[PDB]
């Protein structure tokens, strides 16, 4: 009921020691993006890696 399909990750921040990744949910608008802890992504690590590849390349 409360589980949804991830599309891609588009940002990352640390908030009070919490590392959070901004998730774009498949089929939803950017108004529905949420900040998720890395633990919520442990089943879609490849999606997180694609985002980390981009930010490393953009630096660079």
């Amino acid at each position: 009921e409360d589980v949804f399909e991830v599309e891609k990750i588009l940002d990352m921040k640390t908030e009070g020691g919490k590392v959070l990744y901004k998730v774009r949910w498949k089929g939803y608008t950017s108004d529905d993006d949420t900040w998720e802890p890395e633990i919520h992504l442990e089943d879609c690590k490849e999606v997180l890696l694609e985002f980390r590849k981009k930010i490393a390349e953009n630096k660079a």
């Binding site: 409360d2 949910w25 919520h40 992504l41 879609c44």
Partner: peptide, 5 residues
């Protein structure tokens, strides 16, 4: 598939 906060 992920829990959405």
């Amino acid at each position: 598939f992920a829990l959405k906060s």
